[PDB]
């Protein structure tokens, strides 16, 4: 009899966002890999990180990250900043399903709530605070 209290979402929050990674690797190969990697490393989460459309920021050398579940989103920002040699004054924003995730969440929490059907979490990054601008 209790209502499910549905959490509000931003207007732009959209599932199944486009990533070049997903265009370049067939779904079932991604899914098979994601299942396997979750079993092999259960306290890590597999993450794809890609530059958002229209972003003006350096590209990462590598898209696939195997991340300790307890690492925070904030700690992950700092890791990515270093990987792309951001300057102190440079901005960095992450997006999951078009929405900036909470800096204080763990990567495991983010994964739990937002992983896709292939068992990966997808994060886009940008110099801008709105995905795709």
Domain segments of the chain as ranges: 1-133
- Return d(Cα 45, Cα 67) in angstroms, integer: 5
- Return d(Cα 133, Cα 93) in angstroms, integer: 12
- Strand (E) or helix (H) holding 53: none
Supply 61's token pair. Answer: 């050398």
Resolution attained, angstroms: 1.1
Burial class (CB in 10 A: 0-12, 13-18, 19+), 123: buried
Phi, psi of 14 (to 5 degrees): -140, 130
CB 112 within 8 A of CB 12: no
- Return d(Cα 122, Cα 84) in angstroms, integer: 18
Structure-token match 């990567």, residue found: 107
């Amino acid at each position: 009899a209790e209502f499910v209290e549905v959490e509000p979402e931003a207007k732009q929050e959209i599932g199944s966002m486009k990533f070049v990674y997903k265009e370049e690797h067939p779904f079932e190969k991604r899914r098979s890999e994601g299942e396997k990697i979750r079993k092999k490393y259960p306290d890590r989460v597999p993450v794809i990180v890609e530059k958002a459309p229209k972003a003006r920021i350096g590209d990462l050398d590598k898209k696939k990250y195997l991340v300790p579940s307890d690492l925070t989103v904030g700690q992950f920002y700092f890791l990515i900043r270093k990987r792309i040699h951001l300057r102190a004054e440079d901005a960095l924003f992450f997006f999951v399903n078009n929405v900036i995730p909470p800096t204080s969440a763990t990567m495991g929490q983010l994964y739990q709530e937002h992983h896709e059907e292939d068992f990966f979490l997808y994060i886009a990054y940008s110099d801008e605070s709105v995905y795709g601008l």
